[PDB]
Scaffold this motif. Sequence first.
Motif, mmCIF file in Angstrom:
data_model
loop_
_atom_site.group_PDB
_atom_site.id
_atom_site.type_symbol
_atom_site.label_atom_id
_atom_site.label_comp_id
_atom_site.label_asym_id
_atom_site.label_seq_id
_atom_site.Cartn_x
_atom_site.Cartn_y
_atom_site.Cartn_z
ATOM 1 N N UNK A 141 0.851 -1.184 0.000
ATOM 2 C CA UNK A 141 0.000 0.000 0.000
ATOM 3 C C UNK A 141 0.887 1.234 0.000
ATOM 4 N N UNK A 142 1.889 1.208 -0.875
ATOM 5 C CA UNK A 142 2.876 2.266 -0.949
ATOM 6 C C UNK A 142 2.382 3.588 -1.591
ATOM 7 N N UNK A 143 1.308 3.535 -2.385
ATOM 8 C CA UNK A 143 0.804 4.756 -3.003
ATOM 9 C C UNK A 143 0.091 5.655 -1.965
ATOM 10 N N UNK A 144 -0.063 5.171 -0.735
ATOM 11 C CA UNK A 144 -0.690 5.984 0.314
ATOM 12 C C UNK A 144 0.026 7.235 0.829
ATOM 13 N N UNK A 145 -0.625 7.882 1.785
ATOM 14 C CA UNK A 145 -0.061 9.007 2.483
ATOM 15 C C UNK A 145 1.277 8.586 3.122
ATOM 16 N N UNK A 146 1.243 7.529 3.933
ATOM 17 C CA UNK A 146 2.457 7.083 4.610
ATOM 18 C C UNK A 146 3.506 6.558 3.623
ATOM 19 N N UNK A 147 3.054 5.780 2.648
ATOM 20 C CA UNK A 147 3.921 5.014 1.781
ATOM 21 C C UNK A 147 4.805 5.923 0.973
ATOM 22 N N UNK A 148 4.227 6.984 0.432
ATOM 23 C CA UNK A 148 4.982 7.865 -0.433
ATOM 24 C C UNK A 148 5.875 8.810 0.342
ATOM 25 N N UNK A 149 5.415 9.207 1.533
ATOM 26 C CA UNK A 149 6.236 10.018 2.431
ATOM 27 C C UNK A 149 7.433 9.226 2.970
ATOM 28 N N UNK A 150 7.192 7.986 3.374
ATOM 29 C CA UNK A 150 8.249 7.111 3.881
ATOM 30 C C UNK A 150 9.265 6.719 2.788
ATOM 31 N N UNK A 151 8.753 6.397 1.595
ATOM 32 C CA UNK A 151 9.612 6.069 0.454
ATOM 33 C C UNK A 151 10.603 7.197 0.147
ATOM 34 N N UNK A 152 10.067 8.425 0.045
ATOM 35 C CA UNK A 152 10.872 9.610 -0.182
ATOM 36 C C UNK A 152 12.024 9.694 0.800
ATOM 37 N N UNK A 153 11.720 9.614 2.096
ATOM 38 C CA UNK A 153 12.759 9.752 3.129
ATOM 39 C C UNK A 153 13.833 8.702 2.973
ATOM 40 N N UNK A 154 13.406 7.468 2.718
ATOM 41 C CA UNK A 154 14.301 6.330 2.579
ATOM 42 C C UNK A 154 15.266 6.513 1.399
ATOM 43 N N UNK A 155 14.699 6.820 0.238
ATOM 44 C CA UNK A 155 15.453 6.957 -0.971
ATOM 45 C C UNK A 155 16.470 8.078 -0.786
ATOM 46 N N UNK A 156 16.025 9.176 -0.181
ATOM 47 C CA UNK A 156 16.840 10.366 -0.001
ATOM 48 C C UNK A 156 17.841 10.332 1.159
ATOM 49 N N UNK A 157 17.624 9.513 2.188
ATOM 50 C CA UNK A 157 18.469 9.663 3.377
ATOM 51 C C UNK A 157 19.203 8.397 3.795
ATOM 52 N N UNK A 158 19.005 7.314 3.040
ATOM 53 C CA UNK A 158 19.637 6.039 3.353
ATOM 54 C C UNK A 158 20.044 5.333 2.091
ATOM 55 N N UNK A 159 20.661 4.167 2.258
ATOM 56 C CA UNK A 159 20.979 3.337 1.130
ATOM 57 C C UNK A 159 20.038 2.126 1.000
ATOM 58 N N UNK A 160 18.889 2.172 1.678
ATOM 59 C CA UNK A 160 17.971 1.034 1.653
ATOM 60 C C UNK A 160 17.223 0.942 0.317
ATOM 61 N N UNK A 161 16.862 -0.284 -0.069
ATOM 62 C CA UNK A 161 16.033 -0.572 -1.221
ATOM 63 C C UNK A 161 14.571 -0.609 -0.792
ATOM 64 N N UNK A 162 13.709 0.029 -1.583
ATOM 65 C CA UNK A 162 12.300 0.054 -1.282
ATOM 66 C C UNK A 162 11.553 -0.849 -2.240
ATOM 67 N N UNK A 163 10.792 -1.783 -1.677
ATOM 68 C CA UNK A 163 9.901 -2.628 -2.475
ATOM 69 C C UNK A 163 8.520 -2.207 -2.106
ATOM 70 N N UNK A 164 7.815 -1.642 -3.077
ATOM 71 C CA UNK A 164 6.563 -0.942 -2.811
ATOM 72 C C UNK A 164 5.450 -1.481 -3.683
#
Lengths: 301, 334, 334, 334, 334, 335
Positions: A9-32
Amino acid sequence: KAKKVLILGVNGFIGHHLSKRILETTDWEVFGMDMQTDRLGDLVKHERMHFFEGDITINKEWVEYHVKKCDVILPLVAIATPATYVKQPLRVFELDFEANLPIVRSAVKYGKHLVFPSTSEVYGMCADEQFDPDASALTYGPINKPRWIYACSKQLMDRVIWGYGMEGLNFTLFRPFNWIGPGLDSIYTPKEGSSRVVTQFGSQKRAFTYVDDGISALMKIIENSNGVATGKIYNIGNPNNNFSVRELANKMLELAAEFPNRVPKIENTMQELGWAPQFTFDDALRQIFEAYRGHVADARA
Amino acid sequence: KAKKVLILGVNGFIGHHLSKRILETTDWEVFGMDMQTDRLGDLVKHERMHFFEGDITINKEWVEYHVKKCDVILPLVAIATPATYVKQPLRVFELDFEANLPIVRSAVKYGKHLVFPSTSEVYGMCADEQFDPDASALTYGPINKPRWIYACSKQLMDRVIWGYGMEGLNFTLFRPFNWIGPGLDSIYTPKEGSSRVVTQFLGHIVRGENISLVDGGSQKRAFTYVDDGISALMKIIENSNGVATGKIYNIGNPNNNFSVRELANKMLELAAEFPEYADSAKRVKLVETQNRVPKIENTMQELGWAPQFTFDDALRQIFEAYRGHVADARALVE
Amino acid sequence: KAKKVLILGVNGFIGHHLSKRILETTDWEVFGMDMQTDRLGDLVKHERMHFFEGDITINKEWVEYHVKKCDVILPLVAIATPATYVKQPLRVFELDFEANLPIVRSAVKYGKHLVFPSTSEVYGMCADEQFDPDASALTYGPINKPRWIYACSKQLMDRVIWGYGMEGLNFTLFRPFNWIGPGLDSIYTPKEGSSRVVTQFLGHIVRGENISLVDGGSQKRAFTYVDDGISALMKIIENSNGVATGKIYNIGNPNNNFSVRELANKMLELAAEFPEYADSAKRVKLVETQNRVPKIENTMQELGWAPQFTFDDALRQIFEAYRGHVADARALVE
Amino acid sequence: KAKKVLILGVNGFIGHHLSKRILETTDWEVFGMDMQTDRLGDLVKHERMHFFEGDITINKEWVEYHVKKCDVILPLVAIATPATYVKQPLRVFELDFEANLPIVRSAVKYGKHLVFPSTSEVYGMCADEQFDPDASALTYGPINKPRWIYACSKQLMDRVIWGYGMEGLNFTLFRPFNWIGPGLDSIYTPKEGSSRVVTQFLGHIVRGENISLVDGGSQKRAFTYVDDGISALMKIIENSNGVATGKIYNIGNPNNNFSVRELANKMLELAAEFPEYADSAKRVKLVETTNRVPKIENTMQELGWAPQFTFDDALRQIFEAYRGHVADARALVE
Amino acid sequence: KAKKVLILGVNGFIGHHLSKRILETTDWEVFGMDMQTDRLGDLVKHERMHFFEGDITINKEWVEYHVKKCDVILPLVAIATPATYVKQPLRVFELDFEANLPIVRSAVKYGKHLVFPSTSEVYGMCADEQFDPDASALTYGPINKPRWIYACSKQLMDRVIWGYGMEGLNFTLFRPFNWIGPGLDSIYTPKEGSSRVVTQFLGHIVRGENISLVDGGSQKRAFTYVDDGISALMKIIENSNGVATGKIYNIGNPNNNFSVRELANKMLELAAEFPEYADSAKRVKLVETQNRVPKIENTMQELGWAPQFTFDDALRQIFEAYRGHVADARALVE
Amino acid sequence: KAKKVLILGVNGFIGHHLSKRILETTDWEVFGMDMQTDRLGDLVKHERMHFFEGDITINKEWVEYHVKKCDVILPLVAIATPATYVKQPLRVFELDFEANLPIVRSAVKYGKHLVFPSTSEVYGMCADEQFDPDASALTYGPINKPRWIYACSKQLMDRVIWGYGMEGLNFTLFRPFNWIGPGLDSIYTPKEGSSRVVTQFLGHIVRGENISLVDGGSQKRAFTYVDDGISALMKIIENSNGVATGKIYNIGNPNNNFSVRELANKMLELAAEFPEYADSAKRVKLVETTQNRVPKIENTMQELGWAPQFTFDDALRQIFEAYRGHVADARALVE
Ligand SMILES: [Cl-]
Ligand SMILES: [Cl-]
Ligand SMILES: [Cl-]
Ligand SMILES: [Cl-]
Ligand SMILES: [Cl-]
Ligand SMILES: [Cl-]
Ligand SMILES: [Cl-]
Ligand SMILES: [Cl-]
Ligand SMILES: [Cl-]
Ligand SMILES: [Cl-]
Ligand SMILES: [Cl-]
Ligand SMILES: [Cl-]
């Protein structure tokens, strides 16, 4: 080697906000996983972002596969519209509880870190000045008030997850209190997300939490430095932003002039995660106006 | 022709007493499922009694077939042992909720009357002077107190049934308050039914063991003789003019409200009257380690029902019934 | 149009070397399943290479679709680590046999060529001078030696596939004898492919860790360079005139017959020649804690094939390939 | 409280003789599953005998239920007919392994005692003077001899059961060596139990048909009267002090060691003494077409058991039992 | 926001011509499933064209997901080859009816618009001058004429869909009468779409092969250029104010009314004009081995539709498209 | 050793009459499945009668086990009520086709003789003078006449069975023509067996309610006494030397060929002779509301060695006699 974070449920409010932070501030891979990508914009083009299509009620193989592949599991799919609880209580139970139980069980089977969205409503009519995740009693109305099937479903899921925790599951429960920010969730969207009342726009108060504060706590939970979040339950809210509906209305108009008791206890959240909310109610709403100015179209829908 | 009553988990306290009343006072046929028949005695030889074997977690086809066949459906299978809630919460959820739900859903499918055992525990730490099924709020502890998984499973089940009720399911929920009588279920039997504390205390008395009291046995409970419980159940199954459809009834005697300490003293006093118990009872030491009154207004008025048995009659009837069966009483706590 | 080759467990030793040969020497399309691609390098970039994600124990639909789509089916997924047979025999059976059977059965259903990795271990304690896939008896130890669940699982799968062959399944069984080369599978990789003994020795050598010589280390084995292994697999896949249908091939070089002790010494002497290895290898002791020669006569004549690489050539290639990837080497035993 | 013994495939040679002993010498209860009861004589009458209908490949629910209900689980259903191994190897694997595995797993799930019929054939072409379940190597022919699918399926089942034993499963494997007696299973009956060569030879004899000897009928085997077989099983089921837990027992009489030629001759000599057989027995010629001693030390010592019946005693019992049942004897090869 | 159109079996005649028209004349999105993309030309490049892989008999989850996702559901997968009806009627039933029924059921569950290809064959041997979808009787031969399993399976599907329509399903059934044009489906392709007789005649013509005329080829039929077919489908899918909801439409040109004999003559005569076809055409022998006019009144008036294309214009269009693809024309009968 | 005959839906018209014939004239064993036994009388107490419980839509394991166990498979469970075809077409499809398909497939798997009740309705609006199972065309109305979902479902099942026949399935299809006798199935009972038109006419007559005659009631039909129907079935089940394997038989008496109106009048005349029916029968009026149906039975007669003995008049007289101590059961026929 990089941590893999599964967001259902990554297209949600939380999902897209959390994805952004992850991509921008860590080296983690996001599976959404979701059905549409309209709230993600450019995130999907990022090389550590892996969007995939599916529905948790249907793509059982594809979901299970990603649970085994990933390290941290965020099942964010859930009906969270108060109007639906009353009208179709069974739909609430089937999705928030029954459809999520297999995903919980897969996280157990594959030894993953389950980071699950409980609810601020789980306390119900609790009378404590502060809602304590480790101590407060949980009070709902009689069976003949069906709106309580949402709180009751979420509570039972919390206890089932706790039960698996007693047998070794690495889990963290989190309870968002009225997260608000850019990219608000649509009224009828099947995700744990944003405060309904704020989109729409009187002495009932609630604790409003700017999304960036909410996401920051989540990041610390996912990072789980020293296993401190394992087995724990965190309210994620700003108790200093306890405002009434009237006050929301009056501040939103006072803010729009510039442009042409349910209080969460958060002691354990603050101490254990090295976290504190930074955004005042005023900061929070200023941010939402700054964001939507262009997109008056997206506001109405 | 005749009404058909399906009892899942028949070989025990409610199974026995309900089947007995049905056979002796109506023309209804009973279909009772369980693994054994040692709690039914002679009931099985009755031509209107139909025992069959099966397990609700295994025999899915045979159970569903019986749900389509019968008119009224009572699923009594559940872990209802306080110790297990704490030690094994998942097993409590799996059986009491997860394995009963397909039975509810079959009752929906075939248009049957679902008569479901909710629990007095569902009110939790309710402060009301009488627990009111149409009005009282339901209060449990936090997630880190896993004993509440039982009340929470049973609540969610009542709500899922209520949700089907809104779509046309004919249901009645009943909440037994400390039903007691002959043929108490063994402490670890996975069946809704008999007051565990009274069963535990009886087992201690007959084995000559200490009775342990938490906080000096201050906890008060409403105790209900099984015959009173069964009479309300009969009225629900009969369902004159559909009066029980959509309803939730506490079935308890609010006039038998005694503390756990008062219960121990009363049972100890009663044991001394019987030569079968007196000598074991003499050896018992009371050792040491809040108000739960059912509202039964709707129950009495809608069902034409009233509890007849005092605390004294209830417990006496129990001591009478076990006197020549002391081994059975002793095995209640194994 | 072009032949479609399905490889399940593509991201490893066999998957990589085979795919490479397919892409560079034929017009065939490769469909490769795995969880990650880190062992495939730039191969995925080629237009005739189609990587896709899945797990044979999970993605039942996605795997079967691909069996229907493709012409030749190589199911490479299997626990093939000796230590695991002993400690977790059930995991070996569940994955090597039970999870692979549905894939065999789809190859049957859709009329495909099933090209299945059997094992040189299937012969077990065979006394024959040459292990003959058409004649040699197959000998394992008693039930109380759970190490043999691997060989016994693999023998049963070969017999099931053979039974399907009797009913028209187009199959070919291949039994690699200690294939060795660049990109060895790390010891707990659940794939049929590379010689574990050579892999563990390499790991320990680059780590400056002592080597274990089980029973004095005089067991003789046959070692095979991967390019020779792959050449033979290519012939099987091409299946000129149906020659490989119904057949069972040992793929190995019987001329590379060395003892475990001889292997260890050879590898130690070779490592001394390289600047990346010489320091760590000097620290390696051999610690104390009959013949397994493959007949390859049918493999040679039927497939027009012959192994080209000597023992020395083979080991040399391996040491060369790992000089720049010392951490990969160290990780082989991780 | 009484021990509950579950026999799947009860209507035949083992199920009849075992059930009879249980009912006659214990207080245990028999739960016996099959399709018919024609081989059970008057046993069904006994109030401790519980026959029920079902097929292990169909009635999964009803089978699982009885496994949870019972204490000891004997799954006897298997194709055990040598001609079927050769012609229909897939059916042998499907029934003997694949359809029995869910039963093994239910025994695991419910904490039961799994008493499983392994086979004397599991040793294969073992060279040992006596077949030792704790030590003897196990040797089958190549894949292109599908007869070995029976032994290989049974071996793998033993290793799977053993693997579950390592995780806590209470099991005992037993390997009967040519058990013989009254009530022989007909040659195409899918149950473990009786010696097929003895059964087939009796068929020919009563039918006046020639007996076929392969490679001159020189193979020696150990023959065991059914009563000695049952005595061992009873000791296993009793499991005095848990001694049978985790064990593997050959159940045979090593002193009854006879070739196939000798078996035919002795059977023919014996038939000439019986009026009902003699006329047919005379027509039997032996036609040419073109050692297996069980070690029983652990069996004898751990179970306190010794085989009592000579080969001669055994055959005499068989001819006596079929003497007024010629039709039944003729049906053994249909 | 934009309408999503799901086409199952997209890599073929209808799939290509439909997707093209959608992409060119609307803002709708196409989701097309199939095993390959070789009949899709450059349509996959378009940003509103979403090809994905799958088979309706295997990828149940992926299909159901797309049914929930999309707005309009076109299931085109079906055996529609006359000889297969006769030779393998079970395969026709299994695919055309049984495997499509779950797709219908998902369309019901998720509230979608089901746009289903019924068949001109559903009228069978109807004697009416115009086949009227709202009135004409449906006539098949006896059970011993297995060719009718196609029309019978298709009929039953239409009635099942009509039953769900009675319960709220938004459906439209369409019946193509001999749609023809470039990109004809090969004869053994399992998709509804193009006229097999025209495809078979074109195949023989380009292959210099004889053409077979059953019963002199006096059977008459109506032939419809693909652009006319698609135009009607577009209106159905747009479904302005639900005009096509609950409706059954023949989509044919009744003015293109010709016998099989006339079809053969006209195709051969027209092939003479094409240098690419002339020479193979001269080798063709026509060898001896009912009117079928669609009523289209509801189709014209409700959808605002009329067929524009004459028979001769339709055949020349086909001959032009295959001019530079003789290979593709010859592969039509392989 | 003895032949085992499996009857699914045994508690009704065919179950009862067939089971009786089997028990009294053969050494066969009957395995009969239903929910109740109230239509079976004494039969269950017979040592070769084995009643058991189950429902074909639910007890998949218990039904498949019995298919494997038995030799001859008669799946009688189906909605066969004309009003329900029109009101609830999906339920007709789901039970008659979908829930019977697995039983057919079990009979194939375990090599059994499938004896399947097809229907006289399968011919639909056929114009042939005699409906021929091997030759007559099959004609139904359009999709918007859902009554035809029954005939279409049964046709598809006959073709699926035929298709399995092509691969080795031992099957026989039988099509009853208006089988009538004591123990009629009530019009809402989900079983193949008895003539609904005769059953509803009887039900209404005994209740003193009007009888409907569709389109004047001129259409002629063939009426067959149950004993004649059962005699043909027995021959099919015996299947001596495989005579019935792969065959399709109408089972009807074409000599009992009467219009629907004639049936009404005949039943009304018969009712007047019995004191239990006469008063009710006087009250019945015929209500008209806005094609012969003769079975060809040549293959059935010559192959099976069979011929119907019972006249229309004997047949109806036997029915009226049988119900006269069971008036309430006659009234329930239409409840
Ligand atoms: Cl409410
Ligand atoms: Cl703040
Ligand atoms: Cl607790
Ligand atoms: Cl009182
Ligand atoms: Cl070992
Ligand atoms: Cl070489
Ligand atoms: Cl062989
Ligand atoms: Cl001896
Ligand atoms: Cl045909
Ligand atoms: Cl035109
Ligand atoms: Cl109609
Ligand atoms: Cl006549």
